[PDB]
Each structure stands twice: as C-alpha cells, then as structure tokens.
Amino acid sequence: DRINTVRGPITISEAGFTLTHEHICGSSAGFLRAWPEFFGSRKALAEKAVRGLRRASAAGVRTIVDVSTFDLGRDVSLLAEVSRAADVHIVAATGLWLDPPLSMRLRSVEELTQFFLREIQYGIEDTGIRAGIIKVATTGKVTPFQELVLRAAARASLATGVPVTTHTAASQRGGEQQAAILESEGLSPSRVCIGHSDAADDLSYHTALAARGYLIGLDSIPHSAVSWQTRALLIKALIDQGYTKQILVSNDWLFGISSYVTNIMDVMDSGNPDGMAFIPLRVIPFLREKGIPQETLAGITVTNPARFLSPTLR
C-alpha cells in the first residue's frame, strides 16, 4: 500500500520516522507568489527550509506531513522543491484552516467535497501532486461553515481512505465536537488525528479520545519553549494508560510565517533553534531517560504515522 508525497507515491516502509504536523510556510492563498519579498525572497525561504529539513534529516527524520491547506498559503511547488533538495519525503494536505476566503466560505458541503476529492484524486492546482491527508480547523465551538468542512472531509476520507487531521483549541476540548460530527458521517476514529492536543493538560480528554480509537496529536511541543518538558510528559502519561498506539508527535514548526505579526518567526527561532529537529534531538532523549523503551518510541514515531497515513477504507 502506498502514500502520496510531493515526489509521487511511496511505500509504507519508506516513510520511516515521520513528523505528522509541520509546515514549510504558514501564509495565505496566493501570498507567496504575490509578495515573496515578505520572506526576503522565495529563494531565501526555500534555502532556509532545505537547511532546516536537512538538519532534521541529520537527526533521523525521514518524512514530514505538511498540513498547510489552500487558505494557509500552501504552495505545493515550493514543497516539491524543498523535499527534493532536502531529500526528505513531504506529504501534502487538502482541507481548510481558519482563514477561508469568500470563494470557499460560500460553498456547499457537496462543493467542498468535490474540491477535497480533486486535490486527493487528481492533483493540486496543475501540478499533478496529490494530497495524502485532509486538514480541518475549528474554533472551540464549531461554526456552521466549519461543520460543512468537517462533513466534506469525512466524505472525502470515506471515498479515498486518506486520513483527517484537525486543529483544535484543546483548552476548549474542541476535539469532542469535531469527533461527534465526523462520526455522524460514518468516519472511523482510526482515520482521524485530533490535533493540538498537547495544549490541554486534562488527561481525561486525551485518554477518552484515545480509547475511542482517535489518534492524539501531541504536535506543538516546542511552542512552549518560546515548559516543554511538561508537554512531553503527556506522551508518557498516555503510554502509561495503555494508549501507545494512539500517539502522534510533532513540532508544528514552520520556516516562514506571514499569517501573524511581522517578525514572529525570529522570536520562534530564538526559542527553538532546533526547529523540526526538536522532536528527535530533545523530546526522544527526554522520554528515554524517563524509562520509555526505545521500541515504544520507534512505535510512536514510525509505526503510528504509517498506520495513520496508509489509505484505509475502514
């Protein structure tokens, strides 16, 4: 069985150590091509991303899932150039984040389903690069449009086997409403990662979703470094409850950011100079010294993402 990357299909075995929630650039639709000098230049942003991915490579990372959607300014040609030059697999995403323009906002659930299908089954833009995941974002209480997006995501996942990954505010238990809507469409929890779950510290929330078969995205560990040790101990708490197979870990890093105040990227890079290598270089050794076996950590960073990303019509 095979996973779509920006360089074409790969086998499950080739994915290796996978970071399941990352971004090359957090931007807006059209913005990198209209104003590349916001980032210095397109070449500067690509170079910064290739160096950072090569360093993550130096640490063991073999695949990242770029969960930038259309409205996060995903530029799959950028992703392809960076993947090739870093020699790291990148999974592209479809879906919608929190900044849809009018042309998306106004669409029905049936139209949105066709757009997500197009990106999975045909390709993104005119590139022929197919998405391997669907990303959906909600506010704490899901809005009417966000509910349409979740329903279209579920329908596109049921038709193609590709998984869904979510943005929450876990501070607001946002995954419970997302999961209820997704299940109303018949989507299996084993096809869904409830993301940004490391921003909440009520373990009851994490364990209940994991007991239903959801993947738990503990995906923003180094954002607390801008305590990260405490967020990483959520990984250990889920392992200790018996939910190893439900854990996904990532940095939620980026190499350029225009969807926030200017110069935020410099602040972030000062708090986490390891960038995407933070998970393999800091978190993994930390969990090792708390007594988690290497085998458990390999299961979380290799086997769990492979099972999550492999298209499964179940």
Ligand X SMILES: C[As](C)(=O)[O-]
Chain residues in the site for Zn ion (CB under 5 A): 167, 252
Q: Which of 23, 18, 2 is nearest to 63 (CA)?
A: 18
What does the per-residue mask of binding to ligand X show for 49-88, with x meaning CB under 6 A?
-----------------------x----------------
Q: Is 223 annotated as a binding residue?
A: no
26 binds ligand X (CB under 6 A): yes
Q: For the residues of 241-281, what is the DSSP string, one character each?
A: TT-GGGEEE-----SEE-SSSTTHHHHHHHH-TTGGGHIII
Span from 53-61, 117-125, 162-170, 233-241 in contact with a second copy (CB under 8 A): 117-125
Nearer to a second copy, 40 or 101 (CB): 101
Separation of alpha carbons 217 and 294, rounded Å? 20
Q: Is 196 annotated as a binding residue?
A: yes
Report the nearest approach of a second copy to the CB of residue 285 (Å): 36
Per the DSSP assignment, residues forming a β-bridge with 215 are 193
Let me know: does 230 contact 277? Beta carbons within 8 Å: no
Nearer to a second copy, 261 or 289 (CB): 261
Q: Is 75 annotated as a binding residue?
A: no
Span from 7-15, 122-130, 141-149, 235-243 in contact with a second copy (CB under 8 A): 122-130
Q: Is 252 annotated as a binding residue?
A: yes
126 binds a second copy (CB under 8 A): yes
Report the nearest approach of a second copy to the CB of residue 125 (Å): 5
Interacting positions 57-96 with a second copy (CB under 8 A): 70-71, 73
Residue 117 tokens, joined: 């299908």
Q: Is 21 annotated as a binding residue?
A: yes
Span from 26-34, 143-151, 173-181, 233-241 in contact with a second copy (CB under 8 A): 26-34
Residue 78 tokens, joined: 């950028």
* Cα–Cα distances in angstroms (integers) from residue 80 to residues 4, 46, 96, 253, in the given order: 12, 10, 20, 18
6 DSSP assignment: B
Q: Work out which of 24, 252, 268, 275 binds ligand X, going by CB under 6 A.
A: 252
Residue that is written with structure tokens 């939620």 in the block:
252
36 DSSP assignment: G
295 binds a second copy (CB under 8 A): no
Report the nearest approach of a second copy to the CB of residue 55 (Å): 26
Burial classification of residue 266, based on how many CB atoms lie within 10 Å of its CB (0-12 exposed, 13-18 middle, 19 or more buried): exposed
Gyration radius from the chain CA atoms? 18
Separation of alpha carbons 6 and 83, rounded Å? 7
Measured over the CA atoms of residue 133, residue 284, residue 216 and residue 267, the dihedral's sign is: negative
Residue that is written with structure tokens 């959801």 in the block:
214
Q: Work out which of 155, 167, 173, 206 binds ligand X, going by CB under 6 A.
A: 167
Report the nearest approach of ligand X to the CB of residue 26 (Å): 5
Residues near ligand X (CB under 6 A) are 26, 72, 167, 252
Residues near a second copy (CB under 8 A) are 27-31, 33-35, 37-38, 70-71, 73, 99, 101-104, 106-108, 111, 114-115, 118-119, 124-126, 258-262
